[PDB]
Amino acid sequence: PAQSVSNLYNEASGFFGNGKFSFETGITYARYDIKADNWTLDLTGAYNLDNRWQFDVNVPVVYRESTYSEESVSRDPTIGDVNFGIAYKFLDESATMPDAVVSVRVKAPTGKEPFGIKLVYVPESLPTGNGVWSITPGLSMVKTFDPAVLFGSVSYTHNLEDSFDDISSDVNQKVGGKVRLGDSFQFGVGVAFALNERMSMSFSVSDLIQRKSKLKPDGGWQSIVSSDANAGYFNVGMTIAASNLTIVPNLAIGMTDDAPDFTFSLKFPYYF
Amino acid sequence: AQSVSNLYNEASGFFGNKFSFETGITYARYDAIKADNWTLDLTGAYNLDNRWQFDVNVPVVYRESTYTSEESVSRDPTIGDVNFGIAYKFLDESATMPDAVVSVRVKAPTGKEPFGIKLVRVPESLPTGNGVWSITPGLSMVKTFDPAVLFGSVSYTHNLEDSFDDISSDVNQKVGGKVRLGDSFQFGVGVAFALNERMSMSFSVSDLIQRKSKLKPDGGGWQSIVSSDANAGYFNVGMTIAASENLTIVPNLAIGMTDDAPDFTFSLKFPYYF
Amino acid sequence: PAQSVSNLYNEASGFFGNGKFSFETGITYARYDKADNWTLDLTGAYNLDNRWQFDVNVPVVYRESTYSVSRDPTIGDVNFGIAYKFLDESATMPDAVVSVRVKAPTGKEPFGIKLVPESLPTGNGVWSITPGLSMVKTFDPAVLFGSVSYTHNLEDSFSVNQKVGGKVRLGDSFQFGVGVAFALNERMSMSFSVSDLIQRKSKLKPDGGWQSIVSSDANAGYFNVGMTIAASENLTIVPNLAIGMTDDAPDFTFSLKFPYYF
Ligand SMILES: CCCCCCCCOCCOCCOCCOCCO
């Protein structure tokens, strides 16, 4: 099973199932237009049991400079909302069947919370995480139809309701409350080709819908306006085989207002 | 070559593979005022000796727009502007020469006119059409340079003048009048490959330029509307997928480039070919 | 050979490999949001032995910035370019090339214009040395390729009720891109690429002290889909869509160019 195909399948299927363990460094620039430059170092380890089950942690690391006639704000490399996945390959591909993988991705509020950030207007700091617990079930198909590998994916992210000491952006008020960050549905599809024994290329489109954030001061449920979100991405990416070592570059053209203008990913999946 | 022919149908606008029925779900996202527009197209088409083609399209228009606080407007499954189309394929592809099709698109103002809709200060309602007739002549050429299939396409939209009971956005007033919607030009090109016996992919570009719109209130004079004209630009990525070689699944992303065009537009078309 | 893999390189690399004298004429449309810009680029070129290439480019610019101001066709910023290949590709190496472009301020400078403003400019109005490195390399069938450049702008001396006059320093600019290309058949190729221009801020000193212009800083992301189609033995047709990504690019840009190899 040549590395172009197997790198292509890993990337698409979300299921690092070439070896038995796997560690991966990723670096991701994103550009928001408030002008804003955001880099993101990801660190991600995964192990495999019975060719069929996968477990993994991911640790994100976040530098962030936002500019607001103009004044600058910063956040130096902090975590990160740490997330762990479990994944299960319920269907192995055949002529009649696709490859299929159900998964669940719990994510925890380890990063700096966006709530309580006062306004000395320009923020006194920038966040690194939305401040709540998420749980994201998800599905992904992949099937080779020589020489196009078609692939696709759905997921839904329930956030869990949490409470907070301070939720006033105003510089004089400790107004405590609690927050339901509303749910999201995430859809995406695309097609990939094994260009040669080592290289593979992919075109894909994904979209993300967030269903509006309710809030409750210590008061009644007053939902945050402007908080619901559509986020459209268009992606061109390879897949370049190096050694066990691999480089995976990707561009993400921001089709929506809420998605960043573009985003350059450079991932380095390494397999023991 | 099932995908060659599915590519051409799609590129040309000319069903080669007698009768054709086509159901077409489309989503489109505007955000400049946020808006989520769903369209459903029923289309039926006859084809005569791969030479003449008549067809009819019936759009159906769900719509939802959003204007500290902020109200929303909606618009339940109302049908849009129906249209009949005659296309004549005057060149056959050869070594020397392309695959040429010339066509007219007669488009009738069945949908809910935008004019009159009183702005309840946010609209009272959302339109489903432009309220005027229009005939749009067009050309489309398609030529292989194996395995690259080049294609092109150009059209002009002449809108006819029409009278309305009310052209005013005011709730408090009713001024009837006439309108000339500014005519529009539409150029676009692209390339397409057959990936296998069932599938094709496409990369394409397109532009729509529109002349400005004029009103005439009674009994005043013609007055053109500022910032009414537009240049809607689009980048397309697409595929053909022969499903039962009879059924064809046609997905297509469309990335808006210009503020005048929808942020994106996903499309699904299910040509059924008899 | 082949004629595509040739023309593939010559766009990616910016280097006339397979020719002595070369002349390229091209037309470019760009929409902003309202403005409409066309540019006619007349490029001449000589190349010595897949090793040195010299080239002259004259831009001629027609613009319509609808607030409604025009600027009838007029010469832009004429530029020339010494360019030198320093690695020819092997199984191991890439086709590397180093380049230096001087761009002289032959276009109408933007600094004079008084605020609908009187006229539209057709050039930044200062000189600029502009070095840069290219790579191309075939990993059958993928031709990977990439670019890097800095852009030093030179200082010069030179708003309506009043009329002040002094020195200006245009921001320096780093640029870089990457892309895969394909040889589709004997006559034609297809490309895909990305690039981001990063313009540093711009100081201005009245006849006074150096004041940064807030806003003059910029980031111009672009995404490009392209082709080379071989017409004659020596005429390529080079179409290229360039979808802008950030607010500082144009919404879009088509370019048709026609390099003839004489
Ligand atoms: C809260 C988590 C963020 C939402 C991500 C959901 C995406 C799940 O889609 C399944 C397919 O994913 C494709 C690539 O994912 C790789 C991540 O796992 C690394 C294993 O090597």
Author numbering:
A (entry chain A): 88 to 120, 145 to 179, 193 to 244, 253 to 350, 352 to 376, 378 to 406
B (entry chain B): 89 to 105, 107 to 121, 145 to 179, 192 to 245, 254 to 406
C (entry chain C): 88 to 120, 146 to 179, 196 to 243, 254 to 296, 301, 303 to 350, 352 to 406
Copy text from the publication.
FapC is the main fibre-forming component, with FapB and FapE present in the fibres as minor subunits. FapF is the membrane protein pore component through which the FapB, FapC and FapE substrates are secreted.
The plug helix is also flanked on one side by a specific electrostatic interaction between E111 and R157 linking neighbouring strands within the barrel lumen. Intriguingly, although R157A crystallises under the same condition as the wild type, we found the symmetry of the trimer was disrupted. The structure was solved at 3.2 Å. Despite the more limited resolution, it is clear that the helix plug remains in position. However, in a single monomer of each trimer there is a conformational rearrangement of side chains due to the void generated from removal of the large R157 side chain. While detergent binding is not necessarily relevant for the in vivo activity of FapF, these data together with simulations imply that each pore of the trimer can function independently.
